[PDB]
Recover the amino acids of this structure.
């Protein structure tokens, strides 16, 4: 337990099958960095002592994570990146639950540390292939939805008239009919006295099929399957299956990885798409000195399984916070991601043909952010509009139609070689001339 | 439920409706 | 002794067994909506979307119970929040029927206290609809 | 056991989680009221003795109901209202069966009482939330049926030509096609040699869909699921599910609360509406001095679960018996009911968003009661017509059409501000001028 | 509907397959008895009117109950016995629920009656044979329990130290070890926060097997299976099966006939004995002028199925109330019961080899009632002691032993030809000489 | 969304069935405590903006958590305890998952806050009784 | 305040909410296809096969989830391997519409690196189709 010469092994060669971790580490004053990195490597069975006590195990001889590198953090005075290798034999095949238990189960309480943040993980090809992963992934999703060459468009339903299931479905119909690909259960809407789940499912299925008959395009609504129990959760997933509807939704951090993986496997087995909402992520991922950075939680989700993932907004963020967001968006979507520190990517990640996950971006209040979103995300993203469609003065359907026109004109202009950073206002104003719905949204 | 008090419509309401329909 | 006809004799829920409500009859119903603090809204549908149907059930498993298509109609503009005068609804009825002459038009009302639709009755039948009978339905 | 000082505790403060009971109590002559109230609170294990014998129990120290108030009944000389508080720990969560066993299981035989009637119960929010409750409730039902701003209209099928399943279905078709929302299995029609249940279900499903195709409105028939056994009962509920029909029916007092709650949960899980018939209620609820008042049995039903409940007629009743009926109609339908003795409501009842139940009223022989029914019940009720539709000289469909015209004209007149108590005859006669069916019903 | 001449058919010849009913009837003043008997036969679809309105049905043509005899009650001035015949085609085979629905569903509310009590039913052999009936019946029960030539003994468990499952089981074990055949869950003990059912079942199973190992006799405890739902009820019955324990319990009037019959069939299929508790019977059966006499409810239970039935006490009752009790005890137990008005038996009942049910009698506070109980009930009964065993000064096991000694000495004395009415005090005092436990119970 | 007068209601009487939350709250400098407490009560659908944008919902009229009390933390200069009441109708009966989604789902990212810690919850008897809870508990276990 | 019409207002995915692309607009999209190394291909459908439908689901058990008929259209000739000049696509568009005047025509593009369809937008609506609105769809 934290001997520093057992666990800090700076000449260790990293194996291909090892799981690597990068911990941003804040030692207690007077505790040297090599002792802290070794302690995180060791996960000592004494977390309040901060010293070796019972030493010599068969859990600590060949099944030991080793701290193979400690680097200073530039501009910081008491922070270090400690790199820990874990042998693949430590981990239960296909269990995100067990990988977090092994890596983050205990060390965040260790008294020798003042603060500890888990920045990144290298998931080796040998571990990646044990996971079922996302039920469909971005490509299959586009083929099943028949939707190519633009972002997908969503909006959250917040009805003006009631939270009843019937009014909920009316609003779903009005948004979808106007041009949106998806609408979205709010993450807390599971099954309440004001709106029981099975009533919600039935009225949403009528709305989806009505807007689909009307538009001739495939339509969905993310039906929240998050439940108190695995059996209630599967009761909801089964209902969606039987309605023949395209997509369901789960809050993977509050339901849990064990339930999320069960659900993702049900969705693979029955062809449902799985939208993933990231409620409580800021409890864990917000503070720079402590917790688990979202890119790790996104990587976990890609392994546990989800076809879409709430990935934040880039509205109101500086260029450096935007570099970070684009880093984890690449980890979500791509097959191979190279080490890139300025994007916060600490490890080369090879997904080994595991399907990518579609990021879901909060678009802003209005449609003038459309050029920036298309330029930053590219086409493989859902843009969610929280009140673009509904702050529109003519109502949900023209608001949906205004978002769709703006997305499509920005897409057209991007393909024509125009610079959306410079000319995006000129693209929108030019589409306002022929679209009365977009012209009324820009009057706002 | 409250008692529905009547609202005499404007004198040209029949006329207003007729012009609009055309 | 007369026979209630089964042919072309479709009904559209509340008030469809009465003669079509005149403008004064619509205005008096709107007065009932306003006095209660309710929110009027108009909805419309084409004849093929106007009455209940089962066609989406082809996609289902054993879950069609109380599912029916065409309960939802299409909203005309927005719920008239703060409607106090009945002449706005009567104007909007004329505007909807002018834009959609082949459409049934229904007037609904929402009660924001109980957060639920609380009325719905028909204000306009299209002349070109043969689905319904002009109150010589016997 | 009935010490009078242990169990009659008139300075007890009622807790929020307590279940309260109001017993109308008729002591044997010479037995003081405080001793009877205490005996009802205690549920002594000797019902013949009326005296303490074995005293000191851990079933009788903290799990004891306490008589906290005894009041005289005005105009009566030997009758009292005893108020009993029961701690919520006494009761199995979600089990109406167990609450009646705990409250009424033994006390009605106690020899110190000559007569005992249970008038009212206060069901606390902490107990209310343990119940699934009604599968849909009034609101959801109106959304699923697409029927707003009037009462629903039913009729019982008593065929003129046979009780065979095919003739039963012909009559269902004729009534529904004319304008009724629902028709009704008679409460004794379960599955007999003259008409086996599955044949009845099939022919009724053809009738419902025929009248629905014809009218373009949603139609139902209350298909009686009441059976000898839970397995047979669920066989019938499953058949209705598979026919895709909207509504089934149960006789909750003769089937039992255990079966009714099982059925209500099946109906919530499979989106069926549940009509509840109250056969044998008058065995229990009729005599003023003994039994269990219907408002308690209605409250029980709302907890066990039902979307509609037979609630009597108000034809032929005095204003005071009409005050009582409207009291329990409010307990059936509303979220919050205030204490109101003149309406027989002894406790403030907070349903804590448990969905309300639609009362089903017997309308009279004729259509001239329509103004009174609309004024008394308002729109949230089914009006059942026992021979309005079928005593009509032109047959079932014009009879249905005459009831629907009369309901709609009374609804129109009510919304227009007319006084249906005064002007209801003038409303009906004015609708007779343009409706030949209504004019022929009023010739009768 | 109540024509008086269609439905009152004094000339009618009762059929072998008819179900007969005897209603004690209290007409409203001025309403003749023949009109009331006919109305009860008719079960008119107007209960408020008391007059024919819609007349001519195929439900009123061949499936009509007939009133074939109206007889006045001696000593009463406004009470009559009306005899109604119902054709067997009215009834669902094997469904007590439906039998109750057809006979008592509606007529107790009829306005032409002031009061109505259902005294007796003649269940024909053709209807009797459609029922599964009691899982074992008394004879099968004695063979399975290996217990012959005396009453059985049981006690309800009321612990002095807690209502926890473990203390509940300690008291059971203690009661069973001293000599009792059975102990008894209290009727309200289903599954509470103080004692969850499965914990109760496990500790009671340890107690039963401990006392069985100790005594060498078969032992049971009536494990209450009464639940909120059929699924929960069957979860408990299945648990008892898997523990291999002999007997479970149901509260058939509060659970319901539908659940009771389901349970009785489970018990027949898995060899469990079924004890039946009659909680709420006095809501229905107590008032002479209104309700349903217990003998009908006992007959219903024998059809629905139960191996034991709570049958009251005969302590503190006059000879005439005892004659009634012995009447229904014969209907519970015997194969053929003859018409006997002074015992309240209005019909000859042929059970057609349906197994009898064992009555369970409340024994008194003490052991001096033992000679009377043995003389009145004979051997085929369980005598329940409510505090004989536990009001005993030396505790549960010597109290059990004192009850068993007294029962066995009274049994011995009865077989010897002694008159227990006269000599029973002399029998007990003579057994006190050699039994210190019985001598200490007598000291009380 | 964070109007401060809709959501900060310091004369609200706490109902017995309400779920209460105590948030230790660290506002961004210059943001007053009443605005932050209201924002946590509201769970605004904009977490980057920290200002009202789309206001008027049926998810925000009767199903709204209300900040009914803000207290200073002794010895701290920029920390407050905000007390939030949530109506029991917000919550799925028996679902711990759904209670954390409703209470901690979104507000920990709100930009008007620098830091936010959830200290305590009052679980009302009406919500407590919807849960199965521990399989045995201490007594049964012994 | 205008109402988005539900009548005859069918959409055909990407770019269908824009005015119909002119020949210069199609040529500029083809330039985007060519520069990326993508393979253009044309597809066509008669109006009754143009938009998503559920009719095959009659044959199914409970597996209709994300199944829909008419996602596949019919290929016009072959994917234009080695297409570098946009005038070939414009010629093929004219040839397809000449052979099939009652057909919708869509231009798709395949990315042989990612081995997947990567574009699809409509280049021609048939005049005889009443299913769609001429951008006075309100």
């Amino acid at each position: 337990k934290d001997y520093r010469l057992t666990y800090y092994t700076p000449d260790y060669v990293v194996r291909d099958t090892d799981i690597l971790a990068a911990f941003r580490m804040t030692p207690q004053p007077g505790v040297p960095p090599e002792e802290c990195g070794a302690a995180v490597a060791a996960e000592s069975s004494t977390g309040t002592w901060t010293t070796v006590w019972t030493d010599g195990l068969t859990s600590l001889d060949r099944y030991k994570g080793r701290c193979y590198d400690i680097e200073p953090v530039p501009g910081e005075d008491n922070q270090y990146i400690a790199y820990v290798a874990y042998p693949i034999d430590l981990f239960e095949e296909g269990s995100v639950t067990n990988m977090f238990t092994s890596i983050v189960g205990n060390v965040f309480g260790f008294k020798a540390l003042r603060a500890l943040r888990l920045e990144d993980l290298r998931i080796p090809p040998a571990y990646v292939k044990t996971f079922v992963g996302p039920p469909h992934g971005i490509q299959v999703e586009r083929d099943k939805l028949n939707k190519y060459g633009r972002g997908l468009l969503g909006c959250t339903i917040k009805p003006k008239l009631g939270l009843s299931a019937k009014n909920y479905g009316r609003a779903v119909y009005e948004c979808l009919r106007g041009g949106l690909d998806f609408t979205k259960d709010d993450e807390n809407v599971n099954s309440q006295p004001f709106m029981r789940w099975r009533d919600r499912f039935l009225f949403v299925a009528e709305a989806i099929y009505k807007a689909q008959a009307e538009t001739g395009e495939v339509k969905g609504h993310y039906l929240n399957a998050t439940a108190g129990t695995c059996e209630e959760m599967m009761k909801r997933a089964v209902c969606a299956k039987e309605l023949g509807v395209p997509i369901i939704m789960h809050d993977y951090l509050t339901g849990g990885f064990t339930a999320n993986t069960s659900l993702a496997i049900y969705c693979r087995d029955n062809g449902l798409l799985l939208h993933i909402h990231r409620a409580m992520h800021a409890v864990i991922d917000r503070q720079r000195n402590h917790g688990i950075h979202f890119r790790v939680l996104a990587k976990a989700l890609r392994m546990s399984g989800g076809d879409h993932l709430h990935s934040g907004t880039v509205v109101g963020k500086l260029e450096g916070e935007r570099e970070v967001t684009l880093g984890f968006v690449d980890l979500m979507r791509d097959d191979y991601v190279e080490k890139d520190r300025s994007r916060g990517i600490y490890f080369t990640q090879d997904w080994c043909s595991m399907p990518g996950v579609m990021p879901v971006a909060s678009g802003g209040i209005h449609v003038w952010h459309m050029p920036a979103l298309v330029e930053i995300f590219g086409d493989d993203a859902c843009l969610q509009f929280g009140g673009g469609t509904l702050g529109h003065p003519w109502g949900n359907a023209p608001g949906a139609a205004a978002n769709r026109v703006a997305l499509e004109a920005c897409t057209q202009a991007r393909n024509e070689g125009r610079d959306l950073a410079r000319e995006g206002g000129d693209v929108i104003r030019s589409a306002c001339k022929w679209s009365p719905e977009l012209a009324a949204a820009c009057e706002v | 439920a409250v008692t529905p008090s009547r609202s005499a419509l404007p004198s040209n309401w029949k006329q207003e409706l007729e012009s609009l329909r055309s | 002794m007369m026979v209630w006809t089964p042919v072309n004799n479709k009904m559209f829920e509340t008030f469809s067994y009465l003669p079509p409500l005149s403008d004064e009859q619509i205005a008096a119903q709107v007065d009932y909506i306003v006095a209660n603090g309710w929110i009027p809204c108009l909805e419309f549908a084409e004849s093929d979307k106007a009455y209940v149907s089962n066609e989406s059930a082809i996609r289902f498993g054993s879950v069609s119970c109380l599912y029916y298509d065409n309960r939802y109609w299409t909203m005309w503009k927005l719920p008239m929040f703060g409607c106090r005068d009945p002449m706005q609804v009567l104007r909007e009825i004329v505007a909807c029927t002018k834009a959609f002459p082949d459409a049934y038009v229904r007037l609904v009302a929402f009660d924001n206290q109980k957060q639920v639709q609380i009325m719905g009755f028909l204000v306009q039948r299209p002349k070109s609809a043969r689905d319904w009978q002009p109150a010589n339905k016997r």
User: Anything to note?
Assistant: Residues 13 and 19 of chain B are 10 Å apart (CA to CA). Chains B and A do not touch (no CB pair under 8 Å).
